[PDB]
Every structure is written in C-alpha cells, then in structure tokens.
Scaffold this active site. Sequence first.
Site, PDB file in Angstrom:
ATOM      1  N   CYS A   1      -3.275   8.529   4.564  1.00 39.73           N
ATOM      2  CA  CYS A   1      -3.919   9.673   5.212  1.00 39.73           C
ATOM      3  C   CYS A   1      -5.235   9.319   5.889  1.00 39.73           C
ATOM      4  O   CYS A   1      -5.419   9.712   7.050  1.00 39.73           O
ATOM      5  CB  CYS A   1      -4.162  10.802   4.195  1.00 39.73           C
ATOM      6  SG  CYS A   1      -3.135  10.732   2.716  1.00 39.73           S
TER       7      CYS A   1
ATOM      8  N   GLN B   1       6.490   5.193   1.597  1.00 32.92           N
ATOM      9  CA  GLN B   1       7.165   6.464   1.752  1.00 32.92           C
ATOM     10  C   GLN B   1       7.334   6.800   3.227  1.00 32.92           C
ATOM     11  O   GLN B   1       6.759   6.162   4.112  1.00 32.92           O
ATOM     12  CB  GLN B   1       6.480   7.592   0.964  1.00 32.92           C
ATOM     13  CG  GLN B   1       4.992   7.688   0.940  1.00 32.92           C
ATOM     14  CD  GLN B   1       4.547   8.790  -0.045  1.00 32.92           C
ATOM     15  OE1 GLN B   1       5.385   9.502  -0.626  1.00 32.92           O
ATOM     16  NE2 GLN B   1       3.231   8.975  -0.187  1.00 32.92           N
TER      17      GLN B   1
ATOM     18  N   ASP C   1       6.157   8.744   5.318  1.00 34.09           N
ATOM     19  CA  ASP C   1       4.926   9.506   5.319  1.00 34.09           C
ATOM     20  C   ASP C   1       4.669  10.129   6.686  1.00 34.09           C
ATOM     21  O   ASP C   1       5.042   9.566   7.717  1.00 34.09           O
ATOM     22  CB  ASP C   1       3.784   8.573   4.933  1.00 34.09           C
ATOM     23  CG  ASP C   1       2.604   9.305   4.412  1.00 34.09           C
ATOM     24  OD1 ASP C   1       2.799  10.459   3.986  1.00 34.09           O
ATOM     25  OD2 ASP C   1       1.487   8.723   4.409  1.00 34.09           O
TER      26      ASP C   1
ATOM     27  N   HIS D   1       1.511  12.923   8.728  1.00 33.21           N
ATOM     28  CA  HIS D   1       0.456  13.928   8.718  1.00 33.21           C
ATOM     29  C   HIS D   1       0.507  14.729  10.001  1.00 33.21           C
ATOM     30  O   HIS D   1       0.579  14.159  11.096  1.00 33.21           O
ATOM     31  CB  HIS D   1      -0.904  13.270   8.530  1.00 33.21           C
ATOM     32  CG  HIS D   1      -0.998  12.574   7.225  1.00 33.21           C
ATOM     33  ND1 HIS D   1      -0.631  11.256   7.062  1.00 33.21           N
ATOM     34  CD2 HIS D   1      -1.310  13.036   5.994  1.00 33.21           C
ATOM     35  CE1 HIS D   1      -0.751  10.920   5.794  1.00 33.21           C
ATOM     36  NE2 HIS D   1      -1.170  11.982   5.128  1.00 33.21           N
TER      37      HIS D   1
HETATM   38  C1  X5V Z   1      -3.718  14.724  -1.254  1.00 33.88           C
HETATM   39  O1  X5V Z   1      -3.819  14.098  -0.298  1.00 33.88           O
HETATM   40  C2  X5V Z   1      -2.531  14.469  -2.148  1.00 33.88           C
HETATM   41  N1  X5V Z   1      -1.514  13.974  -1.181  1.00 33.88           N
HETATM   42  C3  X5V Z   1      -0.110  14.097  -1.374  1.00 33.88           C
HETATM   43  O2  X5V Z   1       0.323  14.642  -2.389  1.00 33.88           O
HETATM   44  C4  X5V Z   1       0.855  13.590  -0.267  1.00 33.88           C
HETATM   45  C5  X5V Z   1       2.187  14.030  -0.272  1.00 33.88           C
HETATM   46  C6  X5V Z   1       3.074  13.572   0.782  1.00 33.88           C
HETATM   47  C7  X5V Z   1       2.631  12.739   1.786  1.00 33.88           C
HETATM   48  C8  X5V Z   1       1.266  12.305   1.803  1.00 33.88           C
HETATM   49  O3  X5V Z   1       0.779  11.424   2.858  1.00 33.88           O
HETATM   50  C9  X5V Z   1       0.389  12.739   0.768  1.00 33.88           C
HETATM   51  O4  X5V Z   1      -0.925  12.320   0.780  1.00 33.88           O
HETATM   52  C10 X5V Z   1      -2.940  13.319  -3.129  1.00 33.88           C
HETATM   53  O5  X5V Z   1      -4.055  12.661  -2.587  1.00 33.88           O
HETATM   54  C11 X5V Z   1      -1.888  12.273  -3.241  1.00 33.88           C
HETATM   55  C12 X5V Z   1      -2.448  11.065  -4.071  1.00 33.88           C
HETATM   56  C13 X5V Z   1      -2.214  11.003  -5.416  1.00 33.88           C
HETATM   57  C14 X5V Z   1      -2.725   9.909  -6.158  1.00 33.88           C
HETATM   58  C15 X5V Z   1      -3.468   8.898  -5.536  1.00 33.88           C
HETATM   59  N2  X5V Z   1      -3.961   7.769  -6.351  1.00 33.88           N
HETATM   60  O6  X5V Z   1      -4.428   6.587  -5.736  1.00 33.88           O
HETATM   61  O7  X5V Z   1      -3.936   7.852  -7.781  1.00 33.88           O
HETATM   62  C16 X5V Z   1      -3.708   8.957  -4.186  1.00 33.88           C
HETATM   63  C17 X5V Z   1      -3.198  10.043  -3.448  1.00 33.88           C
HETATM   64 ZN    ZN Z   2      -1.350  12.132   2.950  1.00 31.71          ZN
END
Ligand code: X5V
Ligand code: ZN
Lengths: 399, 399
Positions: free
Chosen positions: B93, B140, B142, B144
């Site tokens: 992101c 993934q 992915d 945005h």
């Molecule tokens: C917030 O950004 C949340 N993101 C997501 O759940 C998400 C879902 C689907 C696609 C994308 O690109 C997404 O960011 C959260 O930051 C996700 C996240 C969880 C854990 C960690 N970590 O390094 O423990 C980072 C990001």
């Molecule tokens: Zn994201």
Amino acid sequence: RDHRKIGKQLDLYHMQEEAPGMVFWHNDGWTIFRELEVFVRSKLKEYQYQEVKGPFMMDRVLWEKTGHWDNYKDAMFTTSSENREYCIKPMNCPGHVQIFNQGLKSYRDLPLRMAEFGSCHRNEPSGSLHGLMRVRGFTQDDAHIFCTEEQIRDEVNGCIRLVYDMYSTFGFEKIVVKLSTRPEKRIGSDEMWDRAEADLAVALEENNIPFEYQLGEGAFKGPKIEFTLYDCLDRAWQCGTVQLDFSLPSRLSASYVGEDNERKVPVMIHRAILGSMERFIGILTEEFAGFFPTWLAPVQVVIMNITDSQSEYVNELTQKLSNAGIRVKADLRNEKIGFKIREHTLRRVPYMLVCGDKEVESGKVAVRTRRGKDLGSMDVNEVIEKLQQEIRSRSLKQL
Amino acid sequence: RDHRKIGKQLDLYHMQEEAPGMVFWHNDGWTIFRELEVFVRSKLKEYQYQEVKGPFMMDRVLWEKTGHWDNYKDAMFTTSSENREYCIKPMNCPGHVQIFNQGLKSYRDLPLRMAEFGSCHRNEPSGSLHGLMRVRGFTQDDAHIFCTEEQIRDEVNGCIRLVYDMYSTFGFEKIVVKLSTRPEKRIGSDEMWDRAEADLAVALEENNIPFEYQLGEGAFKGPKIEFTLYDCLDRAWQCGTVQLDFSLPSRLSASYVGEDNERKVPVMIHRAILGSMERFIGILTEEFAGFFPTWLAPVQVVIMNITDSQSEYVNELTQKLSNAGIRVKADLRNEKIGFKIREHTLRRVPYMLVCGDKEVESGKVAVRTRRGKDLGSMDVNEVIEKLQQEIRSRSLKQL
Ligand SMILES: *C(=O)[C@@H](NC(=O)c1cccc(O)c1O)[C@H](O)Cc1ccc([N+](=O)[O-])cc1
Ligand SMILES: [Zn+2]
Ligand SMILES: *C(=O)[C@@H](NC(=O)c1cccc(O)c1O)[C@H](O)Cc1ccc([N+](=O)[O-])cc1
Ligand SMILES: [Zn+2]
C-alpha cells in the site's frame, strides 16, 4: 536521448531517496517490462527452459558455502529472524542449485535449463547509482544450465544463437564478443579448463564469431564469454554473459548418476542475454528515443471523437480493439481534435484513430501515425489485422 | 487431500530450513502460479486496473509515517545501508501511494485502480508456518483504488462482482460475507464512517448478499468486508478482503484537485480477491486433489510412441501442439506403452495421445484421458481445437 527524461515524459517509472537504486514502475513502464518477459519466455520455449522462482532470502550459512563469499559479503543486504541471519539474495544461482538438489537426477535429465526472472539486491554505494543503468534492485533474464562436460559445446551454441536472435529483434546487429583468460588462482583441473576452453572456441568458430581474448584476468569458476551490443549512437553496452562454473555445483553438493552408474558433479553454465532488464529498458528508451516499436508501446492505439456524437462509436471501437488484444485507449475529452492528436503524438502513441460523422456512418476509421502520416479511412477489421500482425511479428517499423 | 503431499508427488514446489516460510517454486508449480496471474490480469482488464511494481524495501522513516506502525514493527524484516535503515515491505500500500503522489492528480483521474503482484515478507514465528497456508514471503492479487467518497458504492460493487466471478471459475459458489463493526478508537469523522457504511450496505443489498456483522472489533482505517469461500469438503477459507482506508492517504499526503478546484484527500480501498496466491494454490491443490483443470495443469498433454518407428511422428505432433499454445511433452522413453500411460495418469496429465503404426499412417492420434476414458482416434486438428476451447474457456471438466 536521456532515458531519465524520456522516462519522466512518458510516465514510465520514478525513483525517490526513500528507496535509493530501486525503481517504482508505473503502469506504462511496467507494460514494457512485462512485454520483455513475454518475449524472453517465447525464446526460451524454443530450448525447453524450465522457469522457476526462488526465495528472496536464505540463511547466511548457505551463502557462506558458495566460495569467494568474502569478496561479496560486503555487497549483500543482511537481515535476521529468531537469532538466525539471512542475506537478501544478490544472485539466483544458489537457489537454482537448491531446486536441482530436490530429487535424484541422472544423466537423462541433462541438460537441465532453468530460467528465472528473479529480483536480486546489492548494496551498491549510493554515489554510483544512475537512473536505470546502475540500481540496487534488478531483475535479469537469468538462467542456469546443468550439463555434462561433453554437452558444453552444444549448450554454448544455444546461448550464442539466443544472444544474436534476441539482440536483432531490437535492431542491434553490431556485436562484439570477448573471451576471457585463465587467472593464476582457479578452481578445477588444468585438463578440465583445457577441454572447456576448446568447447567455447569450437562453438564460436562454428558460428563464425570474431572473438578477442580480454586483457584482464577472468573468473576462478571457469571460462567466460561477454557480448557487447552497439546502439545507433555507436555506444557500447555489455549485456550478455555466459559463465562456466566448476565450483558452485561442487560446493553446494549437486550431483547426478551418469551412464556408468557413477555419481558425478554437473557443470553449471550461468547465462543472461539482456542482463539487468531495468538497464535494458534504459538502453531501449534511448535507442528508440521514446518511439517504442508497436509491440513494446505502452499504449498502441488511441481512438478520439470530434464531438459527443461519436462517443458511443469510439467506445464500441475501443472495446473491439481491446478484445482483439490491442492496448487501446479512448480519448473522449472535450478538446479540439487537433489538440488531442498533437498530445498523443507527443506521447509517442503509434496509431491514432479519428472518428467523425463520416466514420460512424461508414463503419470505418481515419488512421494517423505518430510520425504524422495520414493513412486514410480504413475498415476496422483491416486495422485490427494489420495491428495484430505488427504485434505478433514484433516489427520494428510501422505501416 | 494434503497439498504438501500432492505438492511433492507432482513436483510443484519445496521448502527447506535454510529459508523458512519461503517457497522454492519448481517448474510445474510456477506454471500454475503464472496461469493464475494471467487469469487475474484478464479479469482486471475488464475494470481497467493499472498494474505497477514497487520496490522491495523502503526507508524506515517512510514506514513510521503510516500509523499503527508500532503494532506491526515487530513483524517486519529490517536491513540497513550507509547508516540508513530499511524495512522489507510487508505490504504494497505505501508503495502504491508513492506512485499516486508522482504527478498532480485531479478528480478526472478517479477512480484510479492500481494492482500489483508484489512479494511481501513478514517475520512470522516459525512455529506457525505450515506448507503454503502460512508463509513468510507471499504474493497476493493486491490492488488499491483511489476514489472519492461518492464513488465508494460503485467501486465496492466492482470488487463484489470480481470476488463472485473469480471464485466461481474454480467451482467455489458457496460464499459467506462478513461486515465489520466500528471500534472504539477510529480515524475519521463519525459522519464519514456513517456515509461509507451506507455505501457498503447499499452495495451488498443490490447484489442480494446475505451479510453478517462480525463480532470482533473492526479496523481503525474504515469499514471492512471479508469473503469466505467453502471448498468441496465444506471447509471455510477466508480469501477476499475489501478494506476502506481514511487514514493512510492522509498520513502519506495523497491529494487531488476536485471539481470545486479544492484540494482533497482520496479515499483508499485496499482489496485482494484470492488473498495470498501461495495459499490459494494450496487450497486449489486440495480442492482438486491434484486433478487440476486443463487450463491450470502444468502439463496438458503427453504424446507417446509405442516403438521407435513413431518417434519422428511424435516429435512432429509435439511441435504442432506446442505451436498451438498447448503445454505438451513427448514421451519417447524405452518403456511399454501401458507403463507410460499409467505413469502419466498417476501424475494427473489431462490427455494422453498414443501413436502407433496406424496413427502415423492415418495422420490421426489415439486419445486417452487421465480418468481412463478412451476417446478413440481423432484428427490432430480436432484435438487441437478441442484443447484450445477447454483452455480459453478455463473449463472445469474434460471432454
Ligand atoms: C490496512 O491496511 C490493513 N490492510 C488489509 O487488510 C489489506 C487487505 C487486502 C489488500 C491490501 O493491500 C490490504 O492492505 C492492514 O494493514 C493489513 C496488514 C496486516 C498486518 C501487517 N503486518 O506487517 O503485521 C501489515 C498489514
Ligand atoms: Zn493495502
Ligand atoms: C559467478 O557466478 C559470477 N556469475 C555471473 O557472472 C552471472 C552471469 C549471468 C547470469 C548469472 O546467473 C550469473 O551468476 C559472479 O558470481 C556474478 C556476481 C558478481 C557479483 C556479486 N556480488 O554480490 O557483488 C554476485 C555475483
Ligand atoms: Zn548465476
């Protein structure tokens, strides 16, 4: 002819100090990069290369088993986890040997050609970084061939053919080839070096390449071949490398069962044709000055209306060209047609399709090129067929 | 139905303790992975997603500007260079916002949909790692979406359609959808949350999805939707996520000029459909038990001779099928035909072409399936057309 200016003008990529030497590829730059991978994949298919993917970091204990590790340990990024230390891979070769070491192999599996588009990182001094030419993260068209001693000549032939065939696709036909001397300190018997040098020399003679022996000392792994292309400014770019290795397969415990049912170490041939593909895109951007050939152009066709009366027609055409596999954009903005054509010409779009009232009623389209050539009103299917031929053949020049 | 056993049997991938939680993809596993990317790319084309590529590490100073960094700083691999500290990216992101921040944007660029197949790394405790399901390096599907407040409902609709359309391709049609509550501590006005929750609720009603509100607290970024598929063993797999974000675009200084010529912060929608694609391959391997549909099968066709008299014919056929875009292998080994057919059936090759003396003289080929069905002697071009249709349509079942 500065790829950093053209890169900015065509919105191909950017860089920032938050990640020095590492490219942010924008949509249009990434399109060129993926097209290059598609091209590479089609050429390897001819030789039945496998394509694999290795992990981004491995235990420092593995990297220390390679050899001349001390010389390169300064250039690797290291990290750690649970009191264990990892190196971000600066090279794909040890990962490929790990894949080769899964499963008993025998002579009937050789030659085993294993390619990867694998991103590698080196901790280059920030002062040496420059555009796409000198980066910290790069992807080369990498591969490793595991073969027997006897198979070296044929395998080096394939690499030679691949170098000349891929370079000519882009218009590079002046090529210089440098062989390497044998240094004081080397791994391997004198006999093993003498036979391999004979394979390389025979392979170059059959293809009638004029090779020089390079003045500097070669590698300790084995004999080496470097290929240098010249661009239309007669600038020299060393891109291809073929590097024989008698050291790494032994250090990392690669073996196969031979015909005599005797366990043996394969020869490894490291090779890359384009080299770093970030760099090759840089060279191409300058070689073409932004006028990418159609198959490489980020946007191949732009379709424009003159008034809102043709917008539905333009959308129809766009969907049709898109379904035919053409990278096509509609320009329905509220701007004069001469303004839109000039704008997309400046952005180096190969073909420009104009849809006025005559073209909606006729089922045709008016075609203009980025060089300003007026090709007239053409049937939509004629345009599609002509475009598909130029793309599938990777032609350097337009219609 | 253990993807680690099937993975080993079909030689898809392996793992070793030198790189825990990180996959070594072999040729056949990587074929499945690239086919999945091709599939994803074709579905995004419909929505005009851009595809970009960000760098693998960025300055820790950038990561500290995100927010709730303290909560995740423990899970990132860090490294360093010239007295500067970097984090291997655990998420795409912030890199996507960097690309969005290159170039002034305005309302006419929105919605801007930006996808990436970007490898990310997290320092997961070694005890939790399992096969392809829980890894340290993952990719993934992915993306945005940068959009305005008004555009949320339409954008969430597209994600909903994409989830149901991609899951059904693989045979997953039982899907459960969970909406999330609003936690005590959140970023954003109450009004901004209330409108966005209305967009999500309207979008789900139009598609007639029965959604539940999840018991646990949601994110602080914004409202969230999770999609869970069920496999043929009625096992639940949460794969899709749509996450609204009112926090990151403001923290990383994203803006656009609106119609009122007023500078505004875009909404971000994070979304992934398959989730980790290493994991999705794991789920698929178990869902199909190794009998991959033809379009996914690493080897689609194997052609065998009975004696050396048909070898030239078999090579001819192989080249023909290969030129027609079919992943095809010739088996010219010195083995009885019943032995070869059994071997390739056990390896789950969809179609098996037998070439004896009758077939060389007739220009036809005898076709057997991996389920043991005898389809008779068929014209080569009939077989090619039937195979191309099954591939292009990504059919779940054979002929
Ligand atoms: C917030 O950004 C949340 N993101 C997501 O759940 C998400 C879902 C689907 C696609 C994308 O690109 C997404 O960011 C959260 O930051 C996700 C996240 C969880 C854990 C960690 N970590 O390094 O423990 C980072 C990001
Ligand atoms: Zn994201
Ligand atoms: C020896 O392996 C030699 N390799 C190559 O020159 C090479 C050429 C083309 C394709 C592949 O895959 C190759 O490995 C040398 O190790 C290359 C190398 C130079 C510098 C560093 N470094 O981290 O400073 C690593 C590897
Ligand atoms: Zn190498």
